[PDB]
Structure formats: C-alpha cells, structure tokens
Design a protein around this ligand. Structure first.
Ligand SMILES: Nc1ncnc2c1ncn2[C@@H]1O[C@H](C[C@@H](N)CC[C@H](N)C(=O)O)[C@@H](O)[C@H]1O
Lengths: 198, 246
C-alpha cells in the first residue's frame, strides 16, 4: 500500500519477519562510535528483510569499517559508496586530522536483483545540511529511480523520514501506521495486543 | 534544487554546483625550506626488494596503477598490492595515503592498511566535476549501481602518531591517470616528518621533499647513504614545518 507507513519500535526487539521482503533497505544506525553496541548491530535480523536487492547503510568514523563488517555478515557485498557533500544554502561546503565535508552511505547488494535502473544517478549527493543527523531527501529520489514502485524499508528513521512506498521503523516515530493488508494481518497475528517486547 | 534529479535531466554532476571549489599559510614557505632535494629511483616494484629503500619512512603515498584507471586505455591487482611488504619500510610511527579507486579497492585497501599495521583515520574523496563534458556518459562497472564520479585516498596511521577531506577538480581527459596534486598539499600540511616516499610515482610527479619510486621513471638519482644523510642529527625528528637547524 503506497502511502507512508511506520512502526514505533525498538529495532532490537521487533520481529521483522512480519514485514515481508523489500527491494531496498536503508539504515542510519546510531553507531557506538542512545546508541547500539557493535554486537547489537551485528545481531540485527537484516537477513530476513530481502532476497534480491540493495542495502543503503549510512556510516561515519569507525563505522566505515564496522558498517562494512555488518554489511558482509548480513549477506551483502558492497558494490558502491555514495558520498553526501554537505553544503549551506549558498552551495558552499560546511576524524581529528581533517575537517569533514561529507558523509558516506555504503551500497550493498544481496542476491541477483533484476529490473533495477542501475546507472541513472551518480554517487555524489550535494545537499544542504539540516538538523543533526538529518540525511538528505535526495536519497529517496535516487532510490525511487533505481527501483520505482517497489516496497522499501527504512531502519532508525524519524518522523520526517516517512515516505510513500516506504515502511519506517524507529523509536522516535509516533505509534503505528500500517495500511498494507499483508503486513496488517501478520502484525495482528504476531502482536495481538499491540505490544512489542523481548 | 535537487541536483540528483538535475543530473538525471542534464548530465551535469551535482558537484558541478559546489561553490568556492586565516590566510596565514607561510607554513607553505617553511615546508619548502625544510624540503629535502627531490630524489627518485626507477624500480620494478614487483621484482624489487623494497627493503633496499632506507631509512624507514614517516609518510608513504601509494598509488598502484589499478585496472579501473584504464577504462578506454602493467596493471596492479589488489592481490599484487596486498603482497607488498609495506610494513618493512614504514617507521614505527608513520602514515600511509593509499589511492583506492572507486570499486573493490575501497574494501581491499582497508584490508591492506590493516595488514601493514595501520588504522584508517581519514577517507579523502577526490570528487570529479564534468563542467566541460556534461554530455559524456560513463560505461559502468558491472556491479555498479550508480555512475562513479569520485576516487578515494585512504589515510592510515601506525604508532602513537586547516584542510578538508574533499578534493574537487574536473574529471581529467581519458587515458590521464594522474591524481590531483592537491593530495601532496594536504599531506605536507599535516607536518608528519620529512622521510616521504611515493610508490608508483612518475617523472611527472617528482617533487621536492619526496622520494619517488616507480617502474616508469626514466632517470634515477637515489643513493641510500646520501638520502639518509638528509635526516642525520640534528635533523632526525623535524616535522617538515619548522625552520632549519643552523
Ligand atoms: N533501539 C532503537 N530502535 C529504534 N530506533 C532507535 C534505537 N536506538 C536509537 N534509535 C533512533 O535511530 C535514530 C538514529 C538517527 N541517526 C537517524 C537519523 C535519520 N536517518 C534522519 O535522517 O533524521 C534516532 O531516531 C534514534 O532515537
């Protein structure tokens, strides 16, 4: 069901098997560079979310390496790396050796995705910084052109991250908003009283 | 303005629209005064005992000729590179700058850094504009999801030890494999020491303050004893950013 959907949850404890399979996963985890430990990140049940498709994983600092570990542990091969060049309103550019002008987003592939429009966009995003950790909305349009109309899921999203065709998971979302009948049914069967524990 | 959409529409890369791309940089002058004479050696790095390069280096810039650099144009695989004995010539406290390209090297270059005993402290991205040829499509790597418009230079540190982690220039002509000379500016302004090695450098990259070693050099002047004499006492520990010792 096309309109935005979301689930306020602790992503460590949600049974993500109820959500089905997705053409694209995106995550912006709170790396321990309210953070998740390295082991909690490794143990996230990312493998059940896709059979064939792409994972977009935001990283900074030592998560450039830890994120690569998670990506591989979860069954992906890193095949691209998007750079977001951070600018002000006048398109000027805004780790203790160098100032940082950018953030990185690893692109992993699982299986053999068919029918994606690879090569339409380039791997550099030039976009304004907004609030802290707020990622650029340009990535949603890149992902939509890569895989139009398909189901996507975002992990650790905030309210401003919800988007059509996306299901957003995160602990700062407001309640639960689910419209896909497949997902509603499996959510009701798994959480009859709406409580997500353990 | 969505510059991603704009690139889809026009072929102008988003980085084409980045603008402007203390004052007191007399650091540059002290660097130039501190610089050793340029020294250089022709050597087939595959068949060369790297341990002959003495003394141990404070900084190593490593620029192996990856196959991905020759898209329309001896290439080194990451198998070849990983087997270089870089740890045998790096000082116990020292730095490495490894050009990794834009594909599997972003992973295998990190494997190399750890193999040689470094940890990554910076990821420097060379972002390439196409202001002069917006209508010139890529030809993607088979595994690529996106058009690749940048290269990465990884900085590694081993031991107990003004610029930004971005270099922006126009994409060079086909068959031109040179990296932006700005990487030398960044490295030298860290003031890491004066024993500086550039592996797989070329005649075109020879520079004061650097020892350049590579297979395509046409001439050599390297002598290990002469080179070591540049760093004998009282000059053994200079950063390359302070005044010479009288
Ligand atoms: N165990 C957890 N489960 C779900 N969400 C969490 C958890 N821990 C932290 N979070 C949230 O993950 C988000 C991390 C942010 N970096 C995400 C930023 C977001 N991508 C944006 O563009 O604004 C925050 O909302 C955290 O409160």
């Amino acid at each position: 069901l096309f309109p935005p959907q979301w689930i306020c949850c602790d992503i460590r404890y949600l049974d993500v098997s109820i959500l089905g399979k997705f053409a694209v996963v995106m995550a912006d985890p709170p790396w321990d560079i309210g953070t998740l430990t390295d082991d909690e990140m490794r143990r996230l049940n990312i493998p059940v979310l896709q059979d064939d498709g792409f994972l977009f994983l935001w990283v900074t600092g030592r998560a450039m390496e830890l994120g690569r570990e998670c990506l591989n542990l979860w069954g992906y091969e890193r095949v691209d790396e998007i750079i977001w060049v951070k600018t002000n309103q006048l398109q000027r550019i805004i780790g203790h050796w160098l100032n940082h002008g950018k953030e990185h987003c690893l692109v992993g592939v699982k299986g053999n995705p068919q029918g994606f429009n690879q090569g339409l966009d380039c791997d550099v995003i030039v976009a304004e910084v907004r609030s802290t950790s707020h990622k650029p909305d340009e990535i949603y349009g890149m992902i939509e052109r890569l895989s139009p109309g398909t189901r996507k899921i975002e992990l650790f999203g905030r309210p401003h991250n919800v988007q059509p065709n996306w299901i957003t998971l995160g602990n700062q979302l407001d309640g639960i908003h689910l419209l896909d009948p497949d997902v509603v049914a499996r959510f009701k069967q798994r959480y009859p009283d709406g409580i997500i524990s353990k | 303005n969505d510059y991603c959409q704009h690139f889809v529409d026009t072929g102008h890369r988003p980085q084409n629209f980045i603008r402007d791309v203390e004052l007191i940089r007399l650091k540059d002058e002290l660097i130039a005064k501190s610089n050793t004479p340029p020294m250089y050696l022709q050597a087939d790095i595959e068949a060369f005992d790297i341990r002959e390069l003495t003394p141990k280096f404070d900084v190593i810039l490593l620029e192996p000729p990856l196959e991905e650099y020759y898209r329309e144009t001896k290439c080194w695989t990451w198998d070849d590179i990983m087997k270089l004995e870089i740890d045998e010539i790096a000082a116990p406290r020292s730095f490495i700058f490894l050009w990794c390209g834009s594909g599997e090297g972003l992973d295998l270059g990190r494997v190399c850094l750890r193999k040689w005993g470094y940890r990554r402290c910076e990821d420097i991205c060379w972002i390439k504009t196409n202001k002069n040829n917006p209508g010139k499509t890529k030809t993607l790597d088979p595994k690529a999801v996106f058009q690749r418009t940048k290269e990465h230079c990884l900085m590694g540190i081993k031991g107990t030890v003004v610029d930004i982690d971005l270099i922006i220039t126009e994409e060079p002509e086909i068959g031109n494999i040179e990296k932006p000379v700005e990487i030398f500016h960044i490295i030298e302004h860290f003031c890491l020491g004066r024993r500086r090695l550039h592996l797989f450098g070329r005649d075109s990259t020879i520079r004061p303050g650097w020892l350049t070693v590579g297979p395509t050099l046409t001439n050599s002047n390297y002598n290990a004893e002469t080179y070591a004499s540049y760093f004998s006492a009282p000059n053994s520990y200079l950063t390359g950013c302070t005044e010479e010792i009288e």
